[PDB]
Design a protein around this nucleic acid. Structure first.
Lengths: 717, 716, 247
RNA sequence: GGCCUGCU
RNA sequence: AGUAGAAACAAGGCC
């Protein structure tokens, strides 16, 4: 016998054994070196799908830009970026007609959000391209650097504390002849001055990198991160787009997985069964080829202008600035290139900024051609990327366009025996087409494809197939007369997360529980997952049962703690205690599950607020095991070594402020008063009301007021 | 204009006015009358409060000026002009302390002795109208409203004037002077009219300057400005534009559906070239074990002492010599490294205490085998520009390799049972629910059928080896460490046994990125001659190290004993994922239990017991020369476990790409098998997408061969 | 008194004085998140990698006078090297376990009140009664159900208002509890929290845990009661239903 | 030659 | 050499 697991599909249908086809038990593919080659490929490719457009020289950045809107209609089935303004506007008009008042209500909601949003909202994000350092920095750090630079240059409307005032400062900075930033050298500081054009290019640029841990692809991809000037406009546009999407039944982007499955089941039920005996029904499991490279921000501006019709001009402007900036966006090429010399046995690193002047003798044919083709678009170490979006950032608005295309087939607009419906989430869709005959089915499919080509959307004919309704696929959800469980996609989440002992335990048990609830994880499979998770947990944190004689760095303390305790069933697994978790206990925290079994000494030492250790929703009880792991500590060798002292001092000031304002941690403070002013005013009023009726009496009240007076005198000085 | 409001009003007052306006986003440039009104309000409130300190008990001194005194008391607390947060904080605090009714709107001041809030307003119109306006605005009104006018007249509730006559007259005179002086320039004209407009604020987000010009270059080609585009969109009317250009568009833009029939699918084309070679981190089917029968658990022991004991149980060592050379490295270095390991083992043995972790001397042999000083020197591009060989890093397609028969036989062996149990899982809470008992019974069936399996032994080997390698790499980034390859099994009789597969010499492991490579030298015992499938041992240097006398009926065979020595490398991500190979059990047994539960719904009772004991149902799990062979549930469990284990051992981007692009085709074929009239738009594209991933990975090539076999047997 | 002298001390130095003078209250949050530390993209890999180091965790500097530098066997429990951008020191896991066997002890009577929802779940599971498991095709339909058992029927902000009123009376702001239901909730939870020395923030998170209702869209079959959604993992499956009566 | 760093 | 696969590691930098 020659074992062949694939032959298992000769009896078990593919959807009922699809988990076998997911090799999610091995390491995912990772990018090793630069991501500049991928960025150049993306720029060249998105400029190739629109080469028949109009070429312009931007008067602000002096950069070449390509406009394929209202370009020649495609004569082939290759990817196209020549979207027609009339077609997009008409699709929006029909989408509004089928859902009257959708745009107006969405605009009202977005207006309320815009008028009530604050700058602090921009701190809830991951790596953002800080232009002050030309580097990816956390959202809060980049926001703080931008605010500091604006205040230094004289743009202080952000002091109002409203996000829209920050956007006003962002726009006002565009009209400044020359800005000034600070640079660190290998330590002190140096003031550098940027012209208007340089600041424009730095504010319009997106930093590129390579995407790691990508499952299901042979070649690596390039992703992008925006700056801080464009993120507030993007936030408002995303608010409007999500408001629109929530009111569309053909959109599944803003909802969860189970909601996606419910929407798909509902549409299948409404399409197939209700179809009469003579009507044929088919399902297309479509993926869009080069989705982002053919999404032109000018069409997004057109959609925004249509949606915001009959609205205040300020709202239109603030929601239009984002597509305007993405239409002029620049892409930073990336890390650069590494060269090797075998005879002399050395290696060298060239930054991407040199690609505009480097001699092409060091590159392959592929990279030489990429650089030669992209050089015309290179402006100050960055490439023009006008033709289309780099990666996402408007997934909601792209889904809105896709849902408009889906809604254009209600049989009111086709005016033919065939019609279509379905679900679409950016770069993926399921399309149910009903028509009385195979001729009608194919005519409907052809019209849907051709209308997609008229809006800059392309159907991937290699990754798409059409069968009879009842079986299909959507975002790795395999529907076969009902969605089937795919445990493989969830398998990578069955180890120790890496937060800390208590958090890891809680997260593991909660993940097992949730996959039992949603993803049909079996009882025996759940028990085995629990056992394996506990084994990996003991082996990762060196917390073995203590009765065992496994020798580790942590084993002496665990053995002594084991011997000390009388009731050893109350010890946490991190303290070398037994595992009491089972199918009935997956929703209970370990501390509470073992609470009545702990010894009073151990219980008090573990759950002590005085411990110096304590500083996907999972419940966790605070214990000494909620420590925080160490930090990277690679800062000490870089020029940016002064950030650590600044962080420490900021933490000191914020801790003192919390000491003054107790609720500073529960709800974020609001107010334009400087920190010192607010603290001093609070101290004055508190001492006042305490002296009048409270702990304080006259002499120490006077002393406190004297200290406050000198504090304010020092503030003014 | 603003020169006026700055010259007359105190810089303190104007600064507070600027703070108040910029709090809500107004601009003194556009709304000047509002700025002046705020300044007037703040000054009136302050001078209402100023110079009037309450004495010991309830009554107030109208002091001549701010005096240095122990009586820091004030008849009023100034809530106006602090901040939204601070003003409301003061309001809440004093309301809680004194119990006064909370004002729904921010008041101006709070009088302590009478314990009540006071609202002060300055009016260009007559006082009574403004008073009744704020009376209707302020209901639940226990606060004392006092209203002044720029012309001067006064009013208040109950005709009650809290402030004394002289201070109010001073305030009146100040407002009077402000009004006539401001009129002396004539701005009183604008201040008469601006009152009603000031109260409401109009938001003024406008596009100007640079961002305006950019707005004119972000439109369709036939538009010259954003105003024109916005007007066009506002006047846009749907007039069948989509249909017209659908008619104009060429008919070659189509999605013609190609029927997918039995004769349509084509067998996947596999790459041609030299046969593929073993790439795993250790020998899987060729490994040999040295046993000591140690009653110690999975980690209860010192690996080096266990290795020494396992090597002392075997006698028959010979002067090692090269049998199958590496053919691209130095074989003498491998031989000397093996002898060095032997010498270091003897040295460890002779000493008193067995070290838990042993460092290997960095000799020339291990220096070559572990790749030290191999990385090129990092230089600045300015210092190396004219060097002829300077060029980009070699970035080409991996060399093509043909599929070999050894991988399929290896997978066959990985699915067979053994006479040892390779899994003892942790404990879990005692079962209290009937479903928990059912789960435990099903789990015991699974572990009974899976524990004695070569795939589980491979799982244990990989987990142990990768854990040891990661811990050694982090602990000793500079020292060459010797790590014995140790596993522990349960014989069928119940006795415990420790097994030694060989040794790993780990080199320097200053791993910064997840892809940074740590090199190591693997030395594994075996009985399989390398002269039978040399293409499988391309990167191994195989020595002859001893002889074995294994029990056989033909006297005793006295077979040889080779040592496979090779250089390999691993990564932090690779090591981390190899430390989690036990998810393969989860995948396999989750599929098995999903099948069991699918069959248990149709038959209204659990069917794990019948499936496992009765051996009733069978599934196609392989093909024999006569045809397709089917096996019981246990063989299916073992086969899926081996598939997952080899996915983990032979992970590669090729595997992921092929898995996705072949899942697509398999689902198309399944739709065909269900009579769903499947169709395709570009099948050649899908095939070329599947075939681009088949380059050199033995596992991926074997999977492609399996898919071809499935297509052959399917579609009939 | 103790706060204002510390404020003066911080205002004495030029750098902290500038930070306090220029930083507005609105930006207070931003500077609290200002950090060079980047969030980890692969936490599991680092935790498996960091746990092999000496001193892989961090602790307050207080540990230097609360825990000895070495235990009986001579193994280091903490080091004097500070974290990257903090005053905290880097310490080993032996410092944790040591604290769990020879550290200070306190009365844990408050914790059953702190995490009282979790203890309620514990006791409801303990007193529950099981029954026969019925194997049959489960028609699990996906519905939006409330997960929080002790829901008081308050939204996130509507409940947060009560939280601020009961925990932070003077920081409530301009909001007045309009509904009499919220008012009586405030009365009762203030009556039971007259003197409970635990810090206000844990009280706020207590009351968020207890009052705020939460919804989630899950595949349910039968039940639909808030206490039955708690053990959905234990009462439903693809081919089986476990009859269970929570206590 | 020693020390410093391993996501900055 | 080895890992690996469209670009990298095979330690980095400061005296």
């Amino acid at each position: 016998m020659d074992v062949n697991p694939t032959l298992l599909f000769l009896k078990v249908p593919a959807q009922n054994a699809i988990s076998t086809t997911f090799p999610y038990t091995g390491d995912p593919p990772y990018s090793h070196g630069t991501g500049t080659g991928y960025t150049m490929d993306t720029v060249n490719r998105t400029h190739q799908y629109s080469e028949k457009g109009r070429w312009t020289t931007n008067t602000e950045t002096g950069a070449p830009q390509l406009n394929p809107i209202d370009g020649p209609l495609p004569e082939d089935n290759e990817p196209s970026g020549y979207a027609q303004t009339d077609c997009v506007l008409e699709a929006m008009a029909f989408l509004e007609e089928s859902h009257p008042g959708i745009f107006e209500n969405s605009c009202l909601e977005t207006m309320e959000v815009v008028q009530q949003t604050r700058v602090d909202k921009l701190t809830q994000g991951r790596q953002t391209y800080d232009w002050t350092l030309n580097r990816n920095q956390p959202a809060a750090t980049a926001l703080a650097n931008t605010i500091e630079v604006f205040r230094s240059n004289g743009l202080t409307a952000n002091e109002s504390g409203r996000l829209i005032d920050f956007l006003k400062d962002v726009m006002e900075s565009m009209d400044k002849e020359e800005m000034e930033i600070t640079t660190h050298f290998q330590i002190g500081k140096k003031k550098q001055r940027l012209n208007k054009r340089s600041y424009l290019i730095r504010a319009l640029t997106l930093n590129t990198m390579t995407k790691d841990a990508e499952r299901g692809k042979l070649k690596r991809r390039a992703i992008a991160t925006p700056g801080m000037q464009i993120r507030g406009f993007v936030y408002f546009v995303e608010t409007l787009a999500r408001s629109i999407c929530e009111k569309l039944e053909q959109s599944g982007l803003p909802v969860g997985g189970n909601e996606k499955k419910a929407k798909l089941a509902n549409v299948v039920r409404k399409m197939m069964t209700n179809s009469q005996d003579t009507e044929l029904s088919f399902t297309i499991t479509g993926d869009n080829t080069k989705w982002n490279e053919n999404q032109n921000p000018r069409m997004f501006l057109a959609m925004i202008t249509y949606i915001t019709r009959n609205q205040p001009e300020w709202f239109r402007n603030v929601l239009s600035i984002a597509p305007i900036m993405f239409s002029n966006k620049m892409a930073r090429l990336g890390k650069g290139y590494m060269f090797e010399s075998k005879s002399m046995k050395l290696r060298t690193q060239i930054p991407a900024e040199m690609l505009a002047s480097i001699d092409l003798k060091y590159f392959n044919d592929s990279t030489r051609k990429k650089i030669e083709k992209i050089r015309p678009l290179l402006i100050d170490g960055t490439a023009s990327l006008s033709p289309g979006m780099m990666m996402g950032m408007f997934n909601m608005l792209s889904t809105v366009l896709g849902v408009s295309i889906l809604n254009l087939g209600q049989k009111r607009y086709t005016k033919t025996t065939y019609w279509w419906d379905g679900l679409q989430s950016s770069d993926d869709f399921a399309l149910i087409v009903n028509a009385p005959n195979h001729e009608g089915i194919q005519a409907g499919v052809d019209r849907f494809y051709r209308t997609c080509k008229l809006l800059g959307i392309n159907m991937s004919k290699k990754k798409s197939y059409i069968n009879r309704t009842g079986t299909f696929e959507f975002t790795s959800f395999f529907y076969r007369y009902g969605f089937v469980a795919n445990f493989s996609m969830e398998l990578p989440s069955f180890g120790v997360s890496g937060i800390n002992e208590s958090a890891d335990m809680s997260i593991g048990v909660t993940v097992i529980k949730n996959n039992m609830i949603n993803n049909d994880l079996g009882p025996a499979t759940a028990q085995m997952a629990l056992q394996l998770f506990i084994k990996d947990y003991r082996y990762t944190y060196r917390c073995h049962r203590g009765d065992t004689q496994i020798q580790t760095r942590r084993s002496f303390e665990i053995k002594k703690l084991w011997e000390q305790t009388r009731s050893k069933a109350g010890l946490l697994v991190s303290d070398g205690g037994p595992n009491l978790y089972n199918i009935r206990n997956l929703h209970i925290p370990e501390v509470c599950l073992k609470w009545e079994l702990m010894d009073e000494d151990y219980q008090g030492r573990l759950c002590n607020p005085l411990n110096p250790f304590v500083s996907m929703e999972y419940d966790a009880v605070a214990t000494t095991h909620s420590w925080i792991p160490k930090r990277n500590r690679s800062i000490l060798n870089t020029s940016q070594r002064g950030i650590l002292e600044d962080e420490q001092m900021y933490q000191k000031c914020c801790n003192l402020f919390e000491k003054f304002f107790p609720s500073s941690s529960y709800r974020r403070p609001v107010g334009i008063s400087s920190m010192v002013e607010a603290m001093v005013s609070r101290a004055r009023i508190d001492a006042r009301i305490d002296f009048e009726s409270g702990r304080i009496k006259k002499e120490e009240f006077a002393e406190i007021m004297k200290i406050c007076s000198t504090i304010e005198e020092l503030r003014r000085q | 204009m603003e020169d006026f409001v700055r010259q007359c009003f105190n810089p303190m007052i104007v600064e507070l006015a600027e703070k108040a306006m910029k709090e809500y986003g107004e601009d003194l440039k556009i709304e000047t009358n509002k700025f002046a009104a705020i300044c007037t309000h703040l000054e009136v409130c302050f001078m209402y409060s100023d110079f009037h300190f309450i004495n010991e008990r309830g009554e107030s001194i109208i002091v001549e000026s701010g005096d240095p005194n122990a009586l820091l008391k004030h008849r009023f607390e100034i809530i106006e002009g602090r901040d939204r947060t601070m003003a409301w904080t003061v309001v809440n605090s004093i309301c809680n302390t004194t119990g006064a009714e909370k004002p729904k709107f921010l008041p101006d001041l709070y009088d302590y002795k009478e314990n009540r809030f006071i609202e002060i307003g300055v009016t260009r119109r007559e006082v009574h109208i403004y008073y009744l306006e704020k009376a209707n605005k302020i209901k639940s009104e226990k606060t004392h409203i006092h209203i002044f006018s720029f012309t001067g007249e006064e009013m208040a509730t109950k005709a009650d004037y809290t402030l004394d006559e002289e201070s109010r007259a001073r305030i009146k005179t100040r407002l009077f002077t402000i009004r006539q002086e401001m009129a002396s320039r004539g701005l009183w004209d604008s201040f008469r009219q601006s009152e009603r407009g000031e109260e409401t604020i109009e938001e003024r987000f406008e596009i100007t300057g640079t961002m305006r010009r950019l707005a004119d270059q972000s439109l369709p080609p036939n538009f010259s400005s954003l105003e024109n585009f916005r007007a066009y969109v506002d006047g846009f009317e749907p007039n069948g534009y989509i249909e017209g250009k659908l008619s104009q568009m060429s008919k070659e833009v189509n999605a013609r559906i190609e029927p997918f029939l039995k004769t349509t699918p084509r067998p996947l084309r596999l790459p041609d070239g030299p046969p593929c070679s073993q790439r795993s981190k250790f020998l899987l089917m060729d490994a040999l074990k040295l046993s000591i029968e140690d009653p110690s658990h999975e980690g209860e022991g010192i690996p080096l002492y266990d290795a020494i004991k396992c090597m002392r149980t075997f006698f028959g060592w010979k002067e090692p010599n090269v049998v199958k050379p590496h053919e691209k490295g130095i074989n003498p270095n491998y031989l000397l490294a093996w002898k060095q390991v032997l010498a270091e083992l003897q040295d460890i043995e002779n000493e008193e205490k067995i070290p838990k972790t042993k460092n290997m001397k960095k000799t020339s042999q291990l220096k070559w085998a572990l790749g030290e000083n191999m990385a090129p020197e990092k230089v600045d591009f300015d210092d190396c520009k004219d060097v002829s060989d300077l060029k980009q890093y070699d970035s080409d397609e991996p060399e093509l390799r043909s599929l070999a028969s050894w991988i399929q036989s290896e997978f066959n062996k990985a699915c067979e049972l053994t006479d040892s149990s390779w899994i003892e899982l942790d404990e879990i809470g005692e079962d209290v629910a009937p479903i928990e008992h059912i789960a435990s019974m099903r789990r015991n069936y699974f572990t009974a059928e899976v524990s004695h399996c070569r795939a589980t032994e491979y799982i244990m080997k990989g987990v142990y080896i990768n854990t040891a390698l990661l811990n050694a790499s982090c602990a000793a980034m500079d020292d060459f460490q010797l790590i014995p390859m140790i596993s522990k099994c349960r014989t069928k009789e119940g006795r415990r046994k420790t097994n030694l597969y060989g040794f790993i010499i780990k080199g320097r492991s200053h791993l910064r990125n997840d892809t940074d490579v740590v090199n190591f030298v693997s030395m594994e015992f075996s009985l399989t001659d390398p002269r039978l499938e040399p293409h499988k041992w391309e990167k191994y240097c195989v020595l002859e190290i001893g002889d074995m006398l294994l029990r056989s009926a033909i006297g005793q065979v006295s077979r040889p004993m080779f040592l496979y020595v090779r250089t390999n490398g691993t990564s932090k991500i690779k090591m981390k994922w190899g430390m989690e190979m036990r998810r393969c059990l989860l995948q396999s047994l989750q599929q098995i239990e999903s099948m069991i539960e699918a069959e248990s719904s149709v038959k209204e009772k659990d069917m794990t017991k019948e499936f496992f004991e009765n051996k009733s149902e069978t599934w196609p799990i392989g093909e024999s020369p006569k045809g397709v062979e089917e096996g019981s549930i246990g063989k299916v469990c073992r086969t899926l476990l081996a598939k997952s284990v080899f996915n983990s051992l032979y992970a590669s981007p090729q595997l992921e790409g092929f898995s996705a692009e072949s899942r697509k085709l398999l689902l198309i074929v399944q739709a065909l098998r269900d009579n769903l009239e499947p169709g395709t738009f570009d099948l050649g594209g899908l095939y070329e997408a599947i075939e681009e991933c088949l380059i050199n990975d033995p596992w991926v090539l074997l999977n492609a061969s399996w898919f071809n076999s499935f297509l052959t047997h399917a579609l009939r | 008194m103790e706060r204002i002298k510390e404020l003066r001390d911080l205002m004495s130095q030029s750098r902290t004085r500038e930070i306090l003078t220029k930083t507005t209250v609105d930006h207070m949050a931003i500077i609290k998140k200002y950090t060079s530390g980047r969030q980890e993209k692969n936490p599991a890999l680092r935790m498996k990698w960091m746990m092999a180091m000496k001193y892989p965790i961090t602790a307050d500097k207080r540990i230097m006078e609360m825990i000895p530098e070495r235990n009986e066997q001579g193994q280091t429990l903490w080091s004097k090297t500070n974290d990257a951008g903090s005053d905290r020191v880097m310490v080993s896991p032996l410092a944790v376990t040591w604290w769990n066997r020879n550290g200070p002890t306190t009365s844990a009577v408050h914790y059953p009140k702190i995490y009282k929802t979790y203890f309620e779940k514990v006791e409801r599971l303990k007193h529950g009664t099981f029954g026969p498991v019925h194997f049959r095709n489960q028609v699990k339909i996906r519905r939006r159900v409330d997960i929080n058992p002790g829901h008081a029927d308050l939204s996130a902000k509507e409940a947060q208002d009560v939280i601020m009123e009961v925990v932070f009376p003077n920081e409530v702001g301009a909001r007045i509890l309009t509904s009499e239901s919220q008012l009586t909730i405030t009365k009762e939870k203030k009556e039971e929290l007259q003197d409970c020395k635990i810090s206000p923030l844990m009280v706020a998170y207590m009351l968020e845990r207890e009052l705020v209702r939460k919804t989630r869209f899950l595949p349910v079959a039968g039940g639909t009661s808030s206490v039955y959604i708690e053990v959905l993992h234990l009462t439903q499956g693809t081919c089986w239903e476990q009859m269970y009566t929570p206590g």
